[PDB]
Amino acid sequence: TMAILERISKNSQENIDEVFTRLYRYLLRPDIYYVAYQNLYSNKGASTKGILDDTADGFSEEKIKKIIQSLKDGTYYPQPVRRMYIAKKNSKKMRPLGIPTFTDKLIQEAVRIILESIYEPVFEDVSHGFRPQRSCHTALKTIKREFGGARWFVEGDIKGCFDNIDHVTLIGLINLKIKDMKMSQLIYKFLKAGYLENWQYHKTYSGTPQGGILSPLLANIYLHELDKFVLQLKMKFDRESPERITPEKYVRYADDFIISVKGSKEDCQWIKEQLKLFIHNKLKMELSEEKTLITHSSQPARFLGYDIRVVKKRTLNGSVELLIPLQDKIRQFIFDKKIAIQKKDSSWFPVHRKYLIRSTDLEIITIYNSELRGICNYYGLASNFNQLNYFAYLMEYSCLKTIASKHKGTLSKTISMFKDGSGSWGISQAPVLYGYARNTLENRLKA
RNA sequence: CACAUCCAUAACGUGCGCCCAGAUAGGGUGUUAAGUCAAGUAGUUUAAGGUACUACUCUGUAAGAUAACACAGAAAACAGCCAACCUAACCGAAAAGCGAAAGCUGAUACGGGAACAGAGCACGGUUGGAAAGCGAUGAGUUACCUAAAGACAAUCGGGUACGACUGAGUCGCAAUGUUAAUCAGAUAUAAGGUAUAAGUUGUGUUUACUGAACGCAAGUUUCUAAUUUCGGUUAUGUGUCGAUAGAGGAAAGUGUCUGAAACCUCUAGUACAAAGAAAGGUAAGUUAUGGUUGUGGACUUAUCUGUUAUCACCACAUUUGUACAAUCUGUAGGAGAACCUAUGGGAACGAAACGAAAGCGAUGCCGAGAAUCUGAAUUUACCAAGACUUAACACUAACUGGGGAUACCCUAAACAAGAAUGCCUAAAGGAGGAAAAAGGCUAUAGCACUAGAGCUUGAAAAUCUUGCAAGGGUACGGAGUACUCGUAGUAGUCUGAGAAGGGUAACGCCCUUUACAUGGCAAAGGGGUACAGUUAUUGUGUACUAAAAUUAAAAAUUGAUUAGGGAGGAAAACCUCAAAAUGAAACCAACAAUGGCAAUUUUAGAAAGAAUCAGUAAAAUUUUACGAACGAACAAUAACAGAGCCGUAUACUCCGAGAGGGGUACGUACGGUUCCCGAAGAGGGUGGUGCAAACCAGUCACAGUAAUGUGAACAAGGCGGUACCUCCCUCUUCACCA
């Protein structure tokens, strides 16, 4: 019943110099206090924002251990942190994750608590972004197309997020408030103890099984720290950058970061040089390739998918700058899709996926229609719907082709094509097709 | 500058598939010698050919029509194709009799049947002249907007593949090829197919491995790749601003309106030349995934007497080069969204795909048409299958004969073997004297063990347990080294081989010669025969010491760095005060710079050290060393599912001038290789899981003389069943293979 670090943060020595938020909060505390105390946690096994879509298995506020916490029953648990991560099929961001145990199954909400602590008159932007998003995909909807100050857009390179870390200034700078300088010593017990397990003995970095689903939480935290001084540069920053070109938005990805107004080049020098000034001075991972020598013109580039623009293509450009679904993505995409030969002669095709005893075309309908949606669905704003369409064309022929292939007939492609499918009205119907293709293209996508 | 829009069709995964001899059971393969066959008219040469002509006939010669000549052809058959058709092929249900039904008997009448391939053994036979597919409605049954925006006009105003969807008439391919006819030689080692497996990744471009049985050999299909408003909508339409002329000037440039510096109308989208623009056909090559090799329609190649003719002049289209349009014209760069340089619009800039990569060479083959040159022939000169018959020869299977061990499953098996009366009238005598059977007579009621049946009977029974040779089928896709079983035979002069030397391949295999007796053969399948191998399993270490850098560091230390520990409601507190309700006091964690065990680095002694002795000679089987592993690996337990490839052939086919490819189970035999190894059902015997029916006064009290019978007591005295879980369980799909 750790209803106490609540105190250890809230009370926290308000006479002898303590908690950073001595400037925003003395009364925003008790609300979130009771939230943790009883609301998000009255019963960790049940009252949680946890793993069984709300919690772990039913534990009487952890019927065994977090019955109590103070005595260090789960004292400094390391949960030996094996290197392990998850990459998602778009909008480049691997996932900081590791083996969550009943302990971690609630450390999740624990650090979520400390998050809301660092949140209420503290935070900005739940996970990556500056305009608080709820998924990369939502971030992928929202954060992009809002500003065109002055030209010559930017890129961003280095990782420093699963490979290079401090983890010690990390836990300290934040410990200066609840881990009070005096009379509060039950704080960092796992903030530290995300103890990585690859014969190496750092912690809380290697997609920590100590806190697994919250490894992103701490990662986001340290990234927020990066931006805590992206601040000072944004102060120094758009002073003349909205002047060098103007006569007629610092990015927080979870992997890449560019800025607001641009337009000159010596400024780009300033950019990368200050980058270097703190890239090690803060992260200890440093600029690669001088991150971009910020680009004068625009270019067909990559930035989590909706390319920065300051026969699988078409001219779409203007005074206002615009996303681009970068074919680049689509290349690997269709590749791993493993359905279109790249060239019998500069030529794309259907091929099922070397799957000979395939499972049932019904669940294949599911597989496709799903991926169809998700792909197109999360594929919100992007210029050139065109190649999206030509994709969809191929993608579709793929679907029913795979289908017929599942049945070993006499070249049954057109048979299926003009027999089933939404066109010939395949319930077994596949209305998640061209119809649904531009249904999505319009719904929640133009929106 | 757009929304809708995109070729079909066989083989690979079934039967019979083991072998030992066939050799017309069907047959087939090919080989030869004998007969026929039929060739627009006739004759010719004299075969009775031929096609060779003589003259004459017919067809056609679109090379965008038109007459004539001059050019090429003209049977007959065989093969074959689609339709439809005994339905005997050949199968099912009834069917049939048959262990006594395990099953076996199905053309029995019915149904299907060119069986999904039987080619490696056919449903036949039959007719006729035809079956998808693909193009274009052959007619129409829905929409669709009617040109100047829509207003009512359907102004049929005009749009039928106008559109949703039924009728294709037509084609063409399907509905085709076979045929013997001057004789050579040279430009073939000609220009070109061509050497040469295999699998197992490394797949990173690496030129690796089994054994690679050829080397050398890495960059790589391409666009990056129409710039004369082809600038802004993909690969068709599909709207537009810009370029120019606004046109009419909507009352549509059709009657009902606003059109205006205009909706809306075409547009106002190089310079020429050149050609053909020719439709079709004839022949070649390109064509959407389970891949490879095929099969059709569509995509490019060439292709189609000349003349006398009448032609009867075609555009457009494109080709090349000129324009400059290039968004630049990227590439790479410097540099206000538009700028600037060698590009050159292909120069890496990429992209992509890849393995002894490609590509190249290498020396083993084929290498038509005989392309042509030149010889020669040249009685119209020549003339011998094209088929189909006969006669004979030789090979012959997946067909015939001869087969046949390894257990299996189940039934009788009268086989056996085992399963034999419950108490009385109460010695004497009888329950079959009354008892009540039991076992048993028809779902067998009683969800369960004596059919509710009367009871018989009172071993019989009919019960279990076993065997079940019987029977039948299970097993013949081969199936590491290993012997045994079944046979040393009928396979046997004649081929894994006689004996061998040679070549002999990666590799056995076949050449020189040797017995007639297994001589060499060497029988089949299926079983048993150890370690490969195999996954699992632990046991034991992943040393057994000691040495080989520390990650080691857990630690002690210390850098004792590192400061600090005050109910939990608490918002400068309220904490509840107490040395001190702040020394953190001396407990908590901070990396440990030294130790730091270890993961281990490797040496390792390996060899009577652990993890084997085989310990022999011999002590008597010990045995130092030495051969000997042994954590410096041994043991336990199940299984080994053909996927190929190279070489000799029943035969095959198809694709081919042939090579050489495709397959025909890794193809059938003998080698030699590499790689066999699950799911999903599933269907068996298991246990447990649970429950409940009881034959069995096993319990009720007992009628009792007991028994037989009395529903609790099935309170599971018990098979069982009973549903879940448990596992070798193919009985079907998994790639037979990008």
| Cβ atoms of A109 and A41 closer than 8 Å | yes
3-state secondary structure of A309: strand
Q: Which nucleotide is nearest to A401 (CA to C1')?
A: B289
Q: Which nucleotide is nearest to A266 (CA to C1')?
A: B335
3-state secondary structure of A195: strand
CB atoms within 10 A of CB A363: 11
Q: How far apart are CA A207 and CA A96, in angstroms?
A: 5
Q: How far apart are CA A121 and CA A314, in angstroms?
A: 47
Q: How far apart are CA A300 and CA A293, in angstroms?
A: 16
Helix axes A361-378, A434-442, angle to 10 degrees: 30
| Cβ atoms of A120 and A126 closer than 8 Å | no
Question: In the numeric block, which tokens belong to residue A84?
Answer: 């392990």
The per-residue b/e assignment along A177-211, b for 16 or more CB within 10 angstroms, e otherwise, is bbbbeeebebbbbbbbbbbbbeeeebbbbbbbbbb
The single-letter code of the amino acid at A310 is: V
Q: What is the DSSP letter of A87?
A: E
- Its sign, for the CA torsion A181, A4, A204, A255, is negative
A447 touches strand B (CB under 7 A): no
Distance, CA of A408 to C1' of B668, in Å: 30
* Cα–Cα distances in angstroms (integers) from residue A416 to residues A160, A421, A423, in the given order: 50, 7, 11
Give, in degrees to the nearest 5, the angle at Cα A208 between A207 and A213. 80
Instruction: State which nucleotides on strand B lie below 7 Å from a protein beta carbon.
Output: 1, 3-10, 13, 221-223, 232-235, 287-291, 327, 334-339, 351-353, 551-554, 563-566, 568-574, 582, 584, 588-589, 591-592, 678-679, 733-736, 738
CB-based contacts of A358, cutoff 8 Å, min separation 6 = A352, A364, A402, A405, A406
* Cα–Cα distances in angstroms (integers) from residue A432 to residues A342, A375, A376, A428, in the given order: 26, 12, 11, 11
CB atoms within 10 A of CB A425: 11
- Its sign, for the CA torsion A111, A177, A285, A229, is positive
User: Which residue's entry shows tokens 């961001």?
Assistant: A93
CB-based contacts of A198, cutoff 8 Å, min separation 6 = A82, A83, A206
User: Which residue's entry shows tokens 């950073």?
Assistant: A20
Q: What is the DSSP letter of A58?
A: -
| Last residue before each gap in chain A (C to N over 2.5 A) | 248, 310, 426
Give the pairing type, strands A94-96 and A85-87.
Answer: antiparallel
CB-based contacts of A401, cutoff 8 Å, min separation 6 = A339, A350, A351, A352, A413, A416
A35 touches strand B (CB under 7 A): no
Question: In the numeric block, which tokens belong to residue A291?
Answer: 């991150």
Closest CA to A210 of A307, A304, A76: A76
A360 touches strand B (CB under 7 A): no
User: Which residue's entry shows tokens 């809230």?
Assistant: A10
3-state secondary structure of A94: strand
Q: Print the SS3 string covering chain A.
A: CCCCHHHHHHCCCCCCCCCCCCCCCCCHHHHHHHHHHHHHCCCCCCCCCCCCCCCCCCCCCCCCCCCCCCCCCCCCCCCCECCCEEECCCCCCEEECCCCCHHHHHHHHHHHHHHHHCCCCCCCCCCCCCCCCCCHHHHHHHCCCCCCCCCCCCCCCCCCCCCCCCCCHHHHHHHHHHCCCCCCCCCCCCCCCCEECCCCCCECCCCCCCCCCCHHHHHHHHHHHHHHHHHHHHHHHCCCCCCCCCCCCCCCCCCCCCCCCCCCCHHHHHHHHHHHHHHHHHHCCCCCCCCCCCCCCCCCCCCCCECCECCCCCCCCCCCCECCECHHHHHHHHHHHCCCCCCCCCCCCCCCCCCCCCCCHHHHHHHHHHHHHHHHHHCCCCCCHHHHHHHHHHHHHHHHHHHHHCCCCCCCHHHHHCCCCCCCCCCCCCCCCHHHHHHHHHCCCCC
Q: What is the CA radius of gyration of chain A?
A: 26
Residue A375 parent element (H or E): helix A361-378
* Cα–Cα distances in angstroms (integers) from residue A391 to residues A142, A396, A398, A434, in the given order: 24, 8, 10, 11
Q: How far apart are CA A159 and CA A140, in angstroms?
A: 20
Q: How far apart are CA A143 and CA A36, in angstroms?
A: 31
The single-letter code of the amino acid at A217 is: L
3-state secondary structure of A96: strand
Q: How far apart are CA A435 and CA A429, in angstroms?
A: 12
Question: CB-based burial of residue A24 (10 Å sphere; 0-12 exposed, 13-18 middle, 19+ buried)?
Answer: exposed
The residues that bridge with A87 in the sheet, in sequence order, are: A94
- Its sign, for the CA torsion A169, A171, A175, A181, is negative
| Cβ atoms of A140 and A378 closer than 8 Å | yes
- Its sign, for the CA torsion A379, A384, A387, A389, is positive
Q: How far apart are CA A12 and CA A25, in angstroms?
A: 13
CA A11 to chain centre: 34
Q: Where are the domains of chain A?
A: 327-442
Q: Which nucleotide is nearest to A202 (CA to C1')?
A: B591
* Cα–Cα distances in angstroms (integers) from residue A11 to residues A72, A169, A259, A362, A373, in the given order: 21, 23, 38, 59, 49
Give, in degrees to the nearest 5, the angle at Cα A128 between A125 and A129. 60
Q: In units of Å, what resolution does this entry have?
A: 5.0
Q: Which nucleotide is nearest to A422 (CA to C1')?
A: B4
Write down the H helix ranges in A169-265: 169-178, 215-237
Closest CA to A152 of A279, A343, A21, A310: A310
Q: How far apart are CA A252 and CA A224, in angstroms?
A: 9
CB-based contacts of A447, cutoff 8 Å, min separation 6 = none
Q: What is the DSSP letter of A90?
A: S
Longest dimension (CA), chain A: 84
* Cα–Cα distances in angstroms (integers) from residue A274 to residues A85, A91, A238, in the given order: 31, 27, 15
Q: How far apart are CA A446 and CA A404, in angstroms?
A: 34
Way the structure was solved:
cryo-EM
Distance, CA of A364 to C1' of B685, in Å: 39
A7 touches strand B (CB under 7 A): yes
- Its sign, for the CA torsion A320, A321, A325, A328, is positive
The residues that bridge with A445 in the sheet, in sequence order, are: none
3-state secondary structure of A322: strand
Phi, psi dihedrals of residue A306, rounded to the nearest 5°: -95, 90
